[PDB]
Amino acid sequence: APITAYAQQTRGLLGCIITSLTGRDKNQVEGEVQIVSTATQTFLATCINGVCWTVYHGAGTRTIASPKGPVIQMYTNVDQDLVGWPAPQGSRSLTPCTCGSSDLYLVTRHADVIPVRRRGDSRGSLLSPRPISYLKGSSGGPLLCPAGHAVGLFRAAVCTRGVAKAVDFIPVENLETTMRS
């Protein structure tokens, strides 16, 4: 089946800030990718195998707000730029890619899926370069395979003149290694 996706805003600036200080979020959760924010920035978090993974460069060492108050991170790997909290009650998890495909599709925070060709184990080239502004706020998002399985988590763009020609991602294998640490 074709990979399609949609986004839905669940809260605003004032609600977000209050929920940040409170650490208590009573909203309902749905989806595999959560649009996440801090007072500093907004990025994404992908649920894979019961764990909600995001970028360390965005979440730092913070807790995630939930109905029961803040939830401490389960995994934290500064070197691999990863953090994980148990997947929020309601979220839906993606599952690691097994087929070892090289044709990946990046899901952005605007719910657009863009094809990227895997080059290295942590690099992939956009088949259609886009300005970096398009990709802004997408770190922590998924790089799916044609079967819809997680291959990696977007973390940085390889750009020039303000145009992203390639992307740098965290393959799911580093997640296994991080959990095992």
Partner: peptide, 22 residues
């Protein structure tokens, strides 16, 4: 330091659907 907050979601599990009239 504040907690990371969920401000929205992206759903990949959706499938072509005929939008219903209300």
């Amino acid at each position: 330091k504040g907690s990371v907050v969920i401000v929205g979601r992206i759903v990949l599990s959706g499938k072509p659907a005929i939008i219903p009239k209300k």
